[PDB]
Design a protein around this ligand. Structure first.
Ligand SMILES: *C(=O)/C=C/c1ccc(O)cc1
Length: 125
């Protein structure tokens, strides 16, 4: 188990050292997106929450293909403003309900340290 707490102030520095195997040891769901919303990384805890198979969703677009319930001003709209501005750090509750039992989660979106990548972190509430 990797010990990093959800919501930690310097989480992007800590997660910069992990490969996909290490990300699978986190206590919470983690998705890495490019600035178009394509999925680059998707960990085991996220798949436990959503039912998706991690290897199968890498390369898909999160907003168009995987998670249409997030294509809303309340989720996608926040992401796209962050990508446009080059800064993003926001936490909110949301319900995931596409092809699954409706599940309430806490979401933390934060710009990654390097380049044009963005984290989505998720835990149950
Ligand atoms: C709504 O369509 C949410 C879907 C969803 C959220 C997060 C995931 O990792 C996968 C699907």
């Amino acid at each position: 188990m990797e010990h990093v707490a959800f919501g930690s102030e310097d989480i992007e520095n800590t997660l910069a050292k992990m490969d996909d195997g290490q990300l699978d040891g986190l206590a919470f769901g983690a998705i890495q997106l490019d600035g178009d919303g394509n999925i680059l990384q998707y960990n085991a805890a996220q798949g436990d929450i959503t039912g998706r198979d991690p290897k199968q969703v890498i390369g898909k677009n999160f907003f168009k293909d995987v998670a249409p319930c997030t294509d809303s001003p309340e989720f996608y709209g926040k992401f796209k403003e962050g990508v446009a501005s080059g800064n993003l750090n926001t936490m909110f509750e949301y319900t995931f309900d596409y092809q699954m039992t409706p599940t309430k989660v806490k979401v933390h979106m934060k710009k990654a340290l390097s380049g044009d990548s963005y984290w989505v972190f998720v835990k149950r509430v």
